[PDB]
Structures are given as C-alpha cells and as structure tokens.
Symmetry: C4
Subunit: 387 residues, 4 copies
C-alpha cells in the first residue's frame, strides 16, 4: 500500500465514454433497493465505489414517504461497488450522515459524515472505519459539505465545508486532513461569493474545486489551493452558464451572474488552462437533460462560443446532481490523472406525483479515442405501487 502521488496533470480528453449505470429505481420497483440521493463515486488504487445518502428506507415501502426532506437522524452514508444497485444486501455502512464526503489516500478510506441538529451539526471523520476526528458547526446554521469525493495529494486529503445561510453570505472553510485527522484549516475570505456542494479534484499537486452558488450566481464559483491551503477564488467566466436554474446563454461574467442566480444544483467542471469542460443540465429552468461542453477559453473568457458538445441525457429526461471523480495513475497505469464524472437521475418529488424522492446514477470517463452522444435516462415508470 502506497499513498497517491497526485502530482501529475489532468489527462486532456476529447470525449466521454460511458462507465456505469445502476438502474436503481427500475430495479427497486420489486427488489430491495435503498431510497437514496446525493450519490457520488470515488476510487481507491484497487476499485471504484458508489457512495450515497440513504433515507433509512427502501423503494416502494411506506417508509419512503416524505423522502423529499434533506436532513433527518435516519440518513446514513453507505457505499457499494460501482454499477450495482444500493441494497441492504450489498452495501457497506460508512457513517450516520445527512451530508457527506469520502476519498482514498492510497492506504485507507476517509469518510466524512455530518449529522445532528441544524444549529450544532457535527462532522464525524473516519479513517479505515475508525473515528479519528470531529468538527462542529461554527456558525450554527447547517454545517454541510461536498456530497462528492474529497481530493488527495501525497497522504493529505482536502475538502470544503460551508456553514451559514443558503440564500445569502455564508462562511466557507478548506480543510487539510491526514490519516483522518484535521491538521490545518482556513476560512476563505470571499465576500459576495457563495460556495456549496463543491466538486474537487487534484491536478499537478494542487486542488481545484467547482461549486454551487445558491445565493446570486447562475455561473459556478471556484476555489483552488495548494497543500498549504494557499488559495485563489473566482467564478467561471464562460457565457455558457453552468448552474440550474440559469439564463439563456449570453455574455458571462468573472463574478456572480445575478440573473436567475438564486437556487441551483450541485455540478462540476474541469479546468484545462484557459479552457473548461462544462457539465450541465439541458434545461435552463428544471433539472432535465445533461450535456458535456468543451469551451477552449471558457474559464476566463466571457463569450458563449464553444467547440464540442456531447449529449448525455435527453432534454425531456430527468437529471439532477452531478460531480467529478478521478482515477489516479496508481489505479490506471497511465501517466496522468484521468477525469471522470457521475450524474444523479432524480425521480419522484417535487416534479412527479409520488410520495417519495430517489435517484439512480450514470457515470462516464474521459478518453481520447472515439465517443458518441446519446441519452442514458433513469427509465423507471412512475408512479409506483406505494405511489
């Protein structure tokens, strides 16, 4: 067992090849499948796993009632092999949590699970399944984290947490964690910025995070930092707006785009110099469809021109949260860090006439060989027997 280096560059990619699909909701119609949301993928030097937040209930059972609710003492972080349905019979317990993150440093798994009351939530950190540290809410207003994988470089793993209003200025902190122990943290000095549900990845020994501004931006904010937590902040400049909801594409801004800026969805983007791979919904108003767009100067340029678009989910099909995950050379045998992403396909409330809300997942990995756009939707027929 050797810790991940994290010192190579991101693999440049021309397209995205489909990696997994679990068909969770379709199967859950009869099978014993957890009601879940906020799934995310993370890899070790040996395997890739799907993490998810359960509602402590199964699909098509009465206890799935009212699962549109985000937080409760019943939610737990669990994981299963990628591509498999999240079931009590194949899932590993990770932590009690209504907000979470996880990642592998090359030696062991780190998991971060937040639970407790809105006014004093506590993040429990585990390393190899053993509690190693905790961190308590410092603003007493819903301590919350990535809902995707943390990023690891040379034995240290990094994450971002938010505490405060989701409709105004909040507080954002970056953490450096070693063997499950917080060794350093810093509060981001970011007035007029808003950070939630960051998707973070390593690249050339440094961390880049693309996040969600729930306050007043329809473009996505970002934060990057080295291992010493020396950071920079900004917003993606592209007129190809990445959040949902958002305005129709037009001239962008290197600051928060106020038009349709309230609300949002977890997302991600991959930075390559001044360019950016943007993953976003197809609809500007609802969580429908998904597409990958290559914009060669979109990180710093404000125009709405782009070079490549690849369809992932049709515009008439349900999508939801999305996030980045990487495969390290230690796993692939490549000489660079390979970018991948996952998409949550949300079914149920509030858009459909059910008593429940749950999601299935698809994932893709970046390649330089031939690829194709299509639609890989959830495919479940609602409502269910329970409703």
């Amino acid at each position: 067992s050797v810790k991940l280096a994290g010192n190579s560059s991101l693999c440049p990619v021309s397209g995205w090849a489909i990696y997994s699909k679990d068909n969770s909701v379709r199967i859950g119609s009869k099978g014993d499948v957890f009601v879940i949301r906020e799934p995310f993928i993370s890899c070790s030097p040996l395997e890739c796993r799907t993490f998810f937040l359960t509602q402590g209930a199964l699909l098509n059972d009465k206890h799935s009632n009212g699962t549109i609710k985000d937080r409760s003492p019943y939610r737990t972080l669990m994981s299963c092999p990628i591509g498999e349905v999240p079931s009590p019979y194949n899932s590993r317990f990770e932590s009690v949590a209504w907000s979470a993150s996880a990642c592998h440093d090359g030696i062991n798994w780190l998991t971060i699970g937040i639970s407790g009351p809105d006014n004093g939530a506590v993040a429990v950190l585990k390393y190899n399944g053993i509690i190693t540290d905790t961190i308590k809410s410092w603003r007493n207003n819903i301590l919350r984290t990535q809902e995707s994988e943390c990023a690891c470089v040379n034995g240290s793993c990094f994450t971002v947490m938010t505490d405060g209003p989701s409709n105004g200025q909040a507080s954002y902190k970056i953490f450096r964690i070693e063997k499950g122990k917080i060794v350093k943290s810093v509060e981001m000095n970011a007035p007029n910025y808003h950070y939630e549900e960051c998707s973070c990845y390593p690249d050339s020994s440094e961390i880049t995070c693309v996040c969600r501004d729930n306050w007043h931006g329809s473009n996505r904010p970002w934060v990057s930092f080295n291992q010493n937590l020396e950071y920079q902040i900004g917003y993606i400049c592209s007129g190809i707006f990445g959040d949902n909801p958002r305005p129709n594409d037009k001239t962008g801004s290197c600051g928060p785009v106020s038009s349709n800026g309230a609300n949002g969805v977890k997302g991600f983007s991959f930075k390559y110099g001044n360019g950016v791979w943007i993953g976003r919904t197809k609809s500007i108003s609802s969580r429908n469809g998904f597409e990958m767009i290559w914009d060669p100067n979109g990180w710093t340029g404000t125009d709405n021109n782009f070079s490549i678009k690849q369809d992932i989910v049709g515009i008439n099909e349900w999508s939801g949260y999305s996030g980045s995950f990487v495969q390290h050379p230690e796993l692939t045998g490549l000489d660079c860090i390979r970018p991948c992403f996952w998409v949550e396909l949300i079914r149920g409330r509030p858009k459909e006439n059910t008593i429940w809300t749950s999601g299935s997942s698809i994932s893709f990995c970046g390649v330089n060989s031939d690829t194709v756009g299509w639609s890989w939707p959830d495919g479940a027929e609602l409502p269910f027997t329970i409703d």
Copy 2:
C-alpha cells in the same frame, strides 16, 4: 495475528460521537430482516461486528408472532458488519442461543451461546467456530450471561454468568477462558447483591463489569477482577441512578437502592477513578430516551450533582438495552483503550399494538473533540402490514 495486550488505560473522553445506525425496523418493513433483540457490538483487530439474538423469523411475516418471548429453541446468535441490517443474506451464523456473549482475543472469535431447558441450560463455547467447551446450569434455574461482549486481556477472555432467581438472591460466577477453554472460574460471594446482564470491559490489565440488579436495586452493581479472578464488588454510589425503573435523582447509596429496585434493564457505565460515565434512559419508569452523564465523583460519591449531560435519544422515543464495547489500540493505533457503547431501540410489544417485538441499534464512540446531543430514534412507523 497477535493477541490483544489489554494493558493500557481507558481513554478519557469529553463526549460521544455517533458511530453507527442500522435502521433495521424501518428497512424490515419491506426487506428481509431478522426479528432480533439483545444486539451488541464487539471488535477484532480488523473490524467491528454487530451480534444479535434472532427469533428465527423475519419482520412482517407471521412467524414473528409472539416474539416478545425471551427463550425458545429457535433463537440463534448471529452477527453482521456494524451498521448493516441483520438479514439472512448478510449475517454469519454463530451459535444456537437464547442468551449469549462474544469477544475477540486478537487471534480468533470466542462465542458463548446458551440453549436448552430452563432447568438444565448449557452454554456452548466456540473458538473460531469450533466447539471447545460447555458449561451446564449449576442451580437449574435459567443459566444466563452478558448479552454483550466479553473482555479480553493477554490471550484470556472473561465473562460473568448467573443461575437462579431473577427476583431474589441468585448465584454469580466469573470465568476465565483461553482459546475457548474454561481454565478457571469462581463463584462471587455476594449476599444481598444481584447481578444480571453484565457489561464488562478491560482497563489496565483488569476487568470491570457494570450490571443489572433485578432484585432490589435501582442503582447498578459492579464487579472488578484481575486475570487471576481476585475480585471486588460494590454498587455505583451516585444519586444519579442508572437502572430502569428507578426513583427521581436524590441521595444515593453504595449498596442496593431498594426504591423502585425490582425489575430493570441491561446497561453499562465507565469508571474513571472516583468518576463515572453513566448511560441511562431518560424516563425513570419506562424504556424511553437515552442520555450520557459524566459524574466526576459518582462511582464513590452519593450526591446527585453531575457535570456533563449529552442527549442520545429523546424522552418520547423508545430505547431499551445498552452496553459497552471497546476498541483496542491494536485496532485504532491509539495508546489507550477507547470506550464505545450501543443502544437497542425496542419496537413492538408490550408497549405497542403489534404481534411482534424487535429492535434496531445505534452506537457511539468516546472522543475528546467537539460533539453534540440529539435524538437518533428507531423511526419505524407501527403497526406493520402483518400487524
């Protein structure tokens, strides 16, 4: 593989961080989940497992009928990974038993399973799944044991068993077991004492047990002993009474507190010099709620003042049995033995209008970082389809 040393002290702790929650009853509404009671946790140098006594039946099935009954030829000891639901598809068979204990000596698992008739029950000892010894009832009146983990020190494991009345003077024996073989035992000379369902843990090469007086004590009896079984006995002196039922907190006694002393519930406490961490229900009369209380002189002092209280389960929510379990430095990498505990959340009879009785579980581990009180209840909606 190396045997656990068990020679370090208990880690001092300031609070308790949530470690697991299985949501068993909620999931069992649809899923294939055992009807269980008396769950308990025990760890090896590699992993932690939940042990439990099944009724040889699944939730929401007709065979769950009359499972309020404690003893039958159908009950078996089984185990599964911590935090997972006890299902026939993920559970390991341990022993046929209606009373049980288990612990890992660093090399292999020891399980103790008692079955047979009330007037001649036999405890079957297994080491690495192989029968290694038996011990038969010596008072012919329901031979019974911990219903939680035994305690191991330097290759020897220790447990306590009781035989005789549950409403009067009985007989209590301590056992030393090596590789599943009883190498020594001694009967405790404890007139006017009553010991049942002991929660035992190792601390500085010696064993401490906190138990249940079902005869005439609303405070908890304790027994401690070295590897040679040289023992001491007493009662927790704190006016913060630990049993259920019990009187309102007042001046305590270093002997059995007779007020509300009959009946009781399995519980635990952690000794730290003259101080004590007490886990107990919130209700004085019923198995509802749960809390952890730090009383700096409560082991030997009779006053009812305490320093710390942490909420675990709300007073309006069902609780039940609770017990200690520890994580050895061989597992954690710490330089002390870490205290943890589990709580059984009992649903169904006799308090609820169902045909069945079963429990789910939560567990916590002691830390010195920030923690928070809350309520992590079972959360199931009764009655069920079967009733």
Copy 3:
C-alpha cells in the same frame, strides 16, 4: 494446504452439544429460501458447509408445487455456510444432481452429482469445481449415492453407490477417488443385504459406513473397508432398532430384521469397539422425533439394554434424514477425529396439507463435557400462503 491424515481414532464422547440450526422453513415463509431436501454437512480444514439438493424453486412460490418428487432435471447440489438459510443470494453452485455426496481432502472440495434418466444416470465428479471424472449406471436402475459426506484418508476419498431395485436385491459398489479421479472400485458381494444412503466416516485410517436397508431390514446394515477397498459387511446387532419404520425394541439380529423391514430412512451410527452411538427417530412408524442412544455392546450384542439416551427432537415434532459428519484434527487441533451429526426436519408432504415438501436442519457435535437433552424442532407454521 495439506491433505487430511485420517489416521487417528474417533473421539470418545459422552454427549452431544448443539452446533447449528438454520430455521430455513420459518424464514422461507417471507424470505427467498430454496425448497430443499437431503441436506448434509461437510468440513474443510478451514470451515464447515451445508450441502443440499434444491428443487430449483423457492418456498412459498408456485414452482414448489409437487416437490415431493425425488428426481428431476431441475435439482441441483448447492452449498452455504453452516447455520445459514439456503438462499440464491448466499449459496454456491456445486453440480446438477438429484443424488449427491461431497467431501474435502484437505486441499480441495470433491463433489459427486448424479443426474440423467432413471435407466442411465451419470455421476459427475468435480475437484475444485472442475469436472474430473464420470461414472455411469451399471444396472440401469437409478444410480444413487450417500446424500451425505464422503470420507477422506491421506489424499484419497471414498464413497458408496447403489444401482438396482429399492425393494429387493441390488448392486453396491465402493469407490476410491483421488483428486476427483476414480482410481479403484469394487462391487460388494452382499447377497440378502441392501445398502442405500450410507453415512460414512474415517477412523484410524479406515472407513466405516452405516446405511439404509430399504428391502427387508429394520436394523441398519454396515460396511467397513481399508484404503485398498478390502471390506467387511454386517448389520448392527442391537435390539435398539435404528431404522424407520421398525418394530418396538426387542431382541435384535446380526442379519436383516425382517419385521417392518420394508421402506426406511437415511441414518447413521458411530462404532466404538463393540459399542455404538445410535441416532434414530422416536416414532417407530413415522419420521417424528429424534434421539441419541449409547449402547455399549450394541454393535455385536442383540439385547435391547442401553446406557445413555439424549433427546434431540420431541416425539410430536417432525424429523427426517440424518447423517454423520466429522471434524478432523487439522481443523480442531485435537488429537482425534470428532464425530458430529445433522438432522433434516422435513415439513410438508406427505404428512401435512401443502403442495410442497422441504426441510430445515440442526446439527450437533460430540463432546465429553456437560450436555443436555431437549427438543429443537423446525417450528414453521403450515400451511403457507401458497399452500
């Protein structure tokens, strides 16, 4: 990995301690549990497994209809950890078979599965899951084997097969198998004898088999042989008749006891010098109850006196097939071969008003410490929803 020696003696035992109980039928009421019969246990140097013949159907499903039938192209030999319910989710596939045997030589598993038509059945031998040999019916009349574990000594495993009438003189052969290859066989010269469903075990480098005479004996026939297949034959002389049905106990015979000799049930017995441990039903007419009897001169003596009786299943409770299995010193660390046994508890047809027939199991191991008699019945409530 080292092959089992099989050169030590059987462990003398004073009683039987309960080892496992699966509660298969109770759980199968709701859970996904195979309809099975002819379960048997067999051990490796590492673990013990339950083998069984499925009907290719689950309990409480329509395909369990008519499962009173013994042979079909749908029956398969499968195995699961001892004490666990036989489910498609925890069971390993072994072979297609309506008659079977299996055993571990210390290195790998040998399985023998017979399938095909009544007039030309073929036994398929597998070693480590790879087909290594076959043997075809030589009398064209239902080739059939032990339905319990084969016996292994120093890298060779031994079994017995029958071909011919089940109500008259048939043909019986002993086989020596090495790494799944038949290296020697011999036909037993046994006129007026009848051998079916032999329970065989190793003892001091030789094999002893106690079997079922379905033709004209209410006592059990036996055959013993060395590694070169030099054999001896006889019948258990004890007036404590072991088969079912049978007459009331009286003066026995060293030949087949004709009274109530037709029909029968698979069983076993352990030989100790002139003495014998006899396992049998409690009823003389039906497959009900079970008991272990120590008869110090019952192997060669014809009286009906005995020294020890231990209750296993109550007379009013269903029992069925039973068989021996052993635990080698390589597994236990003992200096002798430990005798164990299993009992099949048959529910359904023809005794009960269902459409199906299936069994659960219990098992016990021989010890010299204290034990107790009791009743550990199936405990399922019939009929089921499917009927």
Copy 4:
C-alpha cells in the same frame, strides 16, 4: 499471475457432461432475478463466470415489459458465479452494453461493451474494470459483437465485430487486443459471406470462430486466424446443417446454403481436423430442443451421415442461443484445452403469452468418460403473476 499460453490442442472428447444449471426463470418467479438474455460463460485461471445482458429490470415486475427488445440505454453487461441466478445481490457490474464479449488473459478480465445509437454505437473496452480503449461504428449500422467469450493466446485476446445490414452484405473485422488496448485489426475480405455472433476459441496458438449467417446461409460460416490476424474463411460443409431455421438434413455445401438461409441463431461448433462437433436445435424451424452431433468429416465433407448424437434439450422444450467456452490447462491441470458449451433457454415472447422475455442457462464440458443424453429444460411455468 501468468498469462494463458493457449498453445496446446483441443482435448478430443467422446461426449458431454452437464456442468451447470441456474434455474433462473423458475427462481425469478419469487426471487429478485434479472431479466436477461445472451448469457455466456468465460473462465479465468481460478474460476468460471456467467456473463449476461440485463434489461435493467427484474422478473415479475412491470419494468420487464417489452423486454423482447434487443437494444436500449438500460441494458448492462454483468456477471455472476456459474450456476447461480443473476441477481442484483450477487452480480458484478461490468459495462453498459446491448452487445458484448469478455475473456480472461490469465492476468485480468477484458470486457467489451457496446452502447449508444444504432448509427454510431461505441464499443467500450475495459481491462480489470478500467476503460482502456474504444472503437466506434465504421458503417453506422449497429456495431455488434460475439455475445460470447473472446479468445486469448499468450497475452493477446481476439474478437470479431460486425457493422452493416443483418439481411445483406455487411462488414466484418477481427481485432487483436493486449491489456485492453487494440493493437491491430483487419477487415475480412468476405464477399457473399455473412458473419454475426461468432463463437471463438483458441487451439494450438490459433483462433477458430464459428458464427451466424443471417443473410442467406443455413449452414454456419467460419473464420480462423493466427496471432498476426492472417485469416482463412469458409462454411461448414456438413449436410447436418447447424443454423436455425434450416432445411431437413441433405447434401451440404462449402458455401452458404441458401435454403432457409435468412434469419438464424447464435451457435457454435468445434473443429477436429476434418471432423466437427455440432451443437444445434432439434427443430429445423424454431428455437426448440438441443443436441450435440459428432460428424467425423463434417468440416469439409458435404454428406449428411454422422457418428454420434447426444440429446441435451427435448424437441418440445424451448432453447435459444448457444456458444462455446474453454477451460485452459492453467485452470484444469490438463495438457490440452478443454471444450465446453452453454445453452440459453429462452422463455416468454414471442412464442409465449407474456409481457417479457428472458432466459435461463445450462452448460456442459467435454469428456472421454461415460455420458448420457437427456433433457434439461428451463422448467418455468408461464405466464407469471405480472403476465
């Protein structure tokens, strides 16, 4: 771990011994079993696995509706241990695919999964679960592959793919793959030939494929090639026609037999010099029954005489696709490559009045010891509760 040599000859065999049967459809009546088609078996140096294409739905659930359809974004390649039912609880996710192949090179698994639109499908190659390459449709007309195992020789694995019409001249390419990377390919110059769903196996360092002519041949086309992809092509000459549908047996041809040549079914054959082992349906017009036929000069001779016939599935029972798979000496310890085969037993549409279509499987391995013909059918009772 060492790569498979693949340099020995095929083991000559006189008959076929039954190896596995999963009873999938029977069990799926109640159990949680995938709706599947196109199952196939492939082995490593350690184990044999069943691969299959799911419809992302379970039997007896509403989502099984319209599963007669071959292609969709919901279909995935998964695998489970041979002989076990394909369940979400025991199946490993491999790839998103509506056409697939897989094989083990001695070190890791190679999987090939094709998904995407009919006019631009993309094959995703994975080595040890990691995407290693892609290949895109070159004729824009349903890129498709074996639906059985690829063949490996000395670290290189080989497969065949087709692009173009299924009712006329198409394009056929052979691929050489090393560690999941395409290192060479060549288009077959085969005017008037049609290749689909090839069954390929290694033999003396070279690859032989027997395939399906869906255009105008009732006999099967073949292609063989060395590691450098230098190939030869032809048709099986035997008047014992191997496809379905087909004419009654008569004089054959070394070219495509036009009579009943349109349409077909995936199948296989084993070449032995001028002789051939032919597996085929019993019905000439429908997918019913299955038999193995040894024709000593059937590879190059056009007569309709044969030497051996062995019944596998009765003519009145449903069959379906069939394919070859081999066990290498690295797995068996033999000095030759052992031939095995599997048969898909298709139930439901279009031949039966259900809303769904699915298959179970049986498999056999070649031996030189005694064997027997019989019928090992699916055995499910249709329709189901869902219909």
